Amino acid sequence: PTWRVYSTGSNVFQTRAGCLIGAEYVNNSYECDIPIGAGICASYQTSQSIIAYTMSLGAENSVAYSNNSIAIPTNFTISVTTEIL
Amino acid sequence: PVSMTKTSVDCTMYICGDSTECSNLLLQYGSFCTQLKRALTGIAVEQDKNTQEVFAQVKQIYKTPPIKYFGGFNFSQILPDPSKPSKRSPIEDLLFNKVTLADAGFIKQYGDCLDLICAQKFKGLTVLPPLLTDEMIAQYTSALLAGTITSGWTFGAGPALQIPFPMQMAYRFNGIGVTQNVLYENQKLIANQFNSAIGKIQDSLSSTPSALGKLQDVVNHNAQALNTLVKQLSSKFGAISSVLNDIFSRLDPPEAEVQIDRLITGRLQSLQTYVTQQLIRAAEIRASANLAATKMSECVLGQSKRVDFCGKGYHLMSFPQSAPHGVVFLHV
Amino acid sequence: KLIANQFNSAIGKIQDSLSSTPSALGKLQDVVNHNAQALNTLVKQLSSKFGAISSVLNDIFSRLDPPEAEVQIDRLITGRLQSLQTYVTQQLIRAAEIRASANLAATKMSECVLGQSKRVDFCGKGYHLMSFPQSAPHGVVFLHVTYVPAQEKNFTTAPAICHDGKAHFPREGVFVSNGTHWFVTQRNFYEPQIITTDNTFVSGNCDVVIGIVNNTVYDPLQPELDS
Amino acid sequence: IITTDNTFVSGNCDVVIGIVNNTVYDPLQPELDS
């Protein structure tokens, strides 16, 4: 009964997973965080408030594919990675 | 197969709905809900992790060039089209139509629930929606295909480098011990053979004898486990009645306690058996997910010399396609 | 010199990355946490009453007659046995996961440390060169060193070159040109070179290949050794 | 055509089982004899 979360903490957000209360949906696709179903990751951002948004899979790219056009590397890098099993 | 349907169970109402006395009776038994809730949550987390491992493998979203001529080779049947709200390849659409016979339900908002999902839901058996959606999965597949076509294997080892498609096939045939002049002389007929094979793939899939029994098997197993778990409620378990109100009003306290206790023990046995089966199924679910991830890494991102790993014969290419709770590979 | 400097720098950054707060050893800690919570659940399960008058066998025996103390202890025994079989089941379930992880670790050990592996994204990401293992509590740490190219440039390329009515094909390289002249270089590094008889091989005429470019090929024999 | 560039020489003709007498063509001496 006493558990009501005020009268309207924030704009209630209707999602495929159900109803979300206490966060505001933004139109900015950020990297994921504490996740919600159907591709929603909720984040704590800026004062500071908890926000919900849509997953951004990655940075957009387009390779300049063309006839008779090739990319030849001239530099190289030595990389060391750690793996735990 | 990749992942299987995340589900949750409300033990306190499953053991007894609309029975406050039973709630106190089970409280004296301690905790047989914390651990099964933890196991179910871990199962769901592993399910999401399997899909993330399989598909989330590229940090960049690559787009195909507006020109769709690549040495005369066909890619229309596998490239997504903007002519649909879901940017899915026609092969992807055929797969979705073939497997859509059994599904989660595509609706979880309860608005339409006043007749199979609702029956289980009213017994506190919920299904949690997957984290990743089909749009994101198809975007992953499309980006993978575009990067593959436009770069070869370079995008899989760092920065994507453009390279003419016939040149790339030439180096690939050079990678299997065949000189590039063979392709440079037989390119037209090679493209014709490839297009014919791609077209035959479509009629093979669209034909009646569907070979996608693997994915259907998982859904059938989950459904059957759910139904048998539901039906186990009606069992007498050596009691007088299976109705809580009946067994309460028709019996005195000093016997009704053990009467309820017997049913509690029986339903608890049913629940523990069910969760054990869920774990033992998640075992090979994760194993298959790991195998699929390894296969896609070794065949899609590069050319594999392992015998009969990426198809049968001398592998050239493997194209991945998204499937409901699964993934489909086309080995060249 | 540059490669050794890069390797030393990369080795140095590993120490800082590990010693920093965000420990990546979640895998090893998860097993320990799972075992600890399992043992905690099992030890706490003894407090469950299982429908009895009391959870103390001594109290039940002292303050109750055998005729139904027998069934009380019987039911308590059944509940405790259920707890033990459940715990054993959980442990043997986790055992298969441990076995699979150990098998994968041994396979990676053999295929990355004992030799150079060509498998893609198996021994790290990139072009695996060698690997180094490090012992860990209930685990192992591998250090894969890979080759990552950089600073690519774009050059005009041709499938083949015709010289005297016959097509010439690169031996183990590609045909490149940033304009006027044509050169042959390796795929993984820019090292342009003069196109000569030993750099390429002839295969048939030059009217059947698509994209061929009519260019000269140098003979390193006749112009100097004409004596 | 089996030329000097298509093959490499190693050993003599009395240690290999099945070796066949056949000529090897030199692509250097006959036409570039100047």
Ligand SMILES: *[C@@H]1O[C@H](CO)[C@@H](O[C@@H]2O[C@H](CO)[C@@H](O)[C@H](O)[C@H]2NC(C)=O)[C@H](O)[C@H]1NC(C)=O
């Ligand atoms: C590849 O690029 C790196 C970029 O760092 C080059 O590293 C430089 O190497 C020189 C000579 O050792 C140093 O004086 C510079 O300080 C380095 N750069 C930096 C940012 O520290 C490397 O030389 C390049 N190698 C090739 C083959 O192109």
Ligand SMILES: *[C@@H]1O[C@H](CO)[C@@H](O[C@@H]2O[C@H](CO)[C@@H](O)[C@H](O)[C@H]2NC(C)=O)[C@H](O)[C@H]1NC(C)=O
């Ligand atoms: C790849 O093949 C498909 C074949 O379906 C082409 O799509 C069209 O499909 C319809 C129905 O099957 C045919 O009647 C058309 O003739 C096909 N078009 C063409 C141009 O063949 C698709 O266009 C092909 N891809 C490319 C790049 O041509």
Ligand SMILES: *[C@@H]1O[C@H](CO)[C@@H](O[C@@H]2O[C@H](CO)[C@@H](O)[C@H](O)[C@H]2NC(C)=O)[C@H](O)[C@H]1NC(C)=O
């Ligand atoms: C490679 O060749 C292409 C020429 O097409 C150049 O790539 C440019 O790439 C950017 C982004 O990737 C595009 O916005 C430009 O339109 C491309 N240029 C052209 C002319 O289309 C690039 O200059 C060349 N060099 C490298 C290192 O990529």
Ligand SMILES: *[C@@H]1O[C@H](CO)[C@@H](O[C@@H]2O[C@H](CO)[C@@H](O)[C@H](O)[C@H]2NC(C)=O)[C@H](O)[C@H]1NC(C)=O
């Ligand atoms: C393509 O790159 C090569 C490699 O540098 C250029 O070759 C140079 O040509 C000038 C012309 O006199 C010479 O002085 C240089 O010594 C050459 N460099 C090397 C490393 O040999 C070439 O000019 C570039 N442009 C083209 C081929 O159009």
Ligand SMILES: *[C@@H]1O[C@H](CO)[C@@H](O)[C@H](O)[C@H]1NC(C)=O
């Ligand atoms: C070759 O060039 C034509 C004309 O620009 C283009 O339409 C075609 O796609 C190119 N083929 C390639 C890059 O394989």
Ligand SMILES: *[C@@H]1O[C@H](CO)[C@@H](O)[C@H](O)[C@H]1NC(C)=O
């Ligand atoms: C071969 O040289 C002739 C010069 O008469 C030219 O017309 C032709 O285009 C060349 N072949 C190529 C560039 O493939």
Ligand SMILES: *[C@@H]1O[C@H](CO)[C@@H](O)[C@H](O)[C@H]1NC(C)=O
């Ligand atoms: C080739 O002929 C010579 C002729 O004397 C003979 O000695 C030699 O054994 C022959 N070798 C083969 C491989 O037939």
